A and B are shown apart, each in its own frame.
Chain A
Amino acid sequence: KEFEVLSFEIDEQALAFDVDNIEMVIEKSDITPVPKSRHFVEGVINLRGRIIPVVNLAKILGISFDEQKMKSIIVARTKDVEVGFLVDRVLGVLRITENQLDLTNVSDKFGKKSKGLVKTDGRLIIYLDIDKIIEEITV
């Protein structure tokens, strides 16, 4: 009954995904834009010779948004899909657990997009559901 999770920020707003799928976190450099494209995706980058789509988490959620601050992309891979989430910076992996995990999943505004909201040392760490949010983007 022990969680491990990758946690990051968005203009001081903490969140986290499950390291289960997190592939890696590259430092955002250049992001070639894809014209006339669903505005919640900032474009595509070249990762080790393959083309990866960099979606903007801050915008996909609808939160504190500012660009010259977001310097980290969280590449993740599902069964068939691969995406890069752009966020301000990643604090890193964290060891969370049942006791620490709280659940007022009816509390946060973004429905299923985010599982329960957990806290540690008095923090607003929202536990987002990757495999789900990504599926929200693909389909």
Chain B
Amino acid sequence: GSHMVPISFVFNRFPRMVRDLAKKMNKEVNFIMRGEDTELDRTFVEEIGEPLLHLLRNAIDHGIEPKEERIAKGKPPIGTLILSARHEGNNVVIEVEDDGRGIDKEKIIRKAIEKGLIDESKAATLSDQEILNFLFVPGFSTKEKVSEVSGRGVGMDVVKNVVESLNGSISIESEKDKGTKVTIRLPLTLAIIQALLVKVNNLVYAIPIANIDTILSISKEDIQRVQDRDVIVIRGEVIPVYRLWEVLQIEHKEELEEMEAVIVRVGNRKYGIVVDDLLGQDDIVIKSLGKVFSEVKEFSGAAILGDGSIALIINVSGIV
């Protein structure tokens, strides 16, 4: 739902960062951006960012060739950097293209062998592309780690990792003395779910609207404790309810006077989550939270609210 946003959002920091990375290398580059309005999911803008800059850099760093060496090969003095974006089916496509020293697949293969990763006869059944995919394989660029250790960034294996984490994918297309062109394709429609953002002590949690039966605004009294359980009654029907802080044992003031009770349904049974305040409805993208958390049932993933703060996503059936 209008989750998308023009790619301008990510592309405008560049025309300038490009202009500067040129000076810090004396290369003369005619940078071109085209499709600076191709809309891609609100999310991508924050992640897709560093990878593109990286690519952008390489071109200017390694790709584009210095004036001299450039006239020598009979190539106009002024190099060409192209940042483009477009839609091509069920995907968004972002490409960084240049006409520099190319990628010379021949030696990338050699390197690929000396690092005992590929057999020699086997390395013939390769297409120029996969040959280049090596360029991604971890530490396939020796370096040393340093620049990366904590400095000015280094590595594609990541750029791949990233676009792959976005359920996307990328390829390299290059020929020596004819520049290179990397191609990232990200999906055009995500696993968007609608949820009510709910608060509990400046901690934000999200409840799939797809389960919410109805929301009510109760008082710290309407919750009556039976033997063990805590329930509330609504026009008759007794509906069992759980106090979210307690369900997650969360250091909590105590409780205001006024609150909210989200009533959700799972299969044949229904109950309610009690919270401090409502925050609003929204469309969030469910992103899983590592293996360090697989075990946690209460949450079925997390999400990155616009402002950048995380909001754990409640698993109706996962709660007690």
* Nearest chain A residue, comparing its CB with the CB of B139: A20
In the complex, what distance in Å separates the CA atom of A89 from the CA atom of B287?
30
Do A46 and B309 touch across chains, with their CB atoms under 8 A apart?
Answer: yes
Do B302 and A93 touch across chains, with their CB atoms under 8 A apart?
Answer: no
* A34-B145 contact given A44-B310, A82-B290, CB 8 Å threshold: no
* A41-B304 contact given A24-B150, A34-B299, CB 8 Å threshold: no
Min CB–CB distance A4 → chain B (angstroms): 7
In the complex, what distance in Å separates the CA atom of A137 from the CA atom of B294?
11
Do A46 and B310 touch across chains, with their CB atoms under 8 A apart?
Answer: yes
Is A25 interfacial (CB-CB < 8 Å)? yes
Min CB–CB distance B319 → chain A (angstroms): 10
In the complex, what distance in Å separates the CA atom of A45 from the CA atom of B256?
29
Q: Which of B21-80 contact A (CB under 8 A)?
A: 43, 46-47, 49-50
Residues of B within 8 A of A44 (CB): 289-290, 293, 302, 310
- Majority-rule SS of A interface residues: strand
Q: Which of A7-62 contact B (CB under 8 A)?
A: 19-20, 22-25, 30, 32-38, 41, 44-46, 48-53, 55
Residues of A within 8 A of B287 (CB): 50-51
Is B124 interfacial (CB-CB < 8 Å)? no
Count the A residues whose beta carbon is within 8 Å of the partner chain — how many?
36
Do B290 and A53 touch across chains, with their CB atoms under 8 A apart?
Answer: yes
In the complex, what distance in Å separates the CA atom of A24 from the CA atom of B149?
6
Min CB–CB distance B216 → chain A (angstroms): 23
Residues of A within 8 A of B150 (CB): 22, 24-25, 92-93
Report B's interface with A, CB cutoff 8 A: 43, 46-47, 49-50, 144-146, 148-150, 161-162, 165, 203, 247-250, 287, 289-293, 295-296, 298-299, 302, 304, 308-310, 312
Pairs across A and B, CB under 8 Å, 26 listed = A6-B149, A23-B148, A24-B150, A33-B203, A34-B296, A34-B312, A35-B249, A36-B247, A36-B248, A36-B249, A36-B296, A41-B293, A44-B290, A44-B293, A46-B309, A48-B46, A48-B47, A49-B43, A49-B47, A52-B290, A53-B289, A55-B292, A77-B161, A81-B292, A93-B149, A139-B291
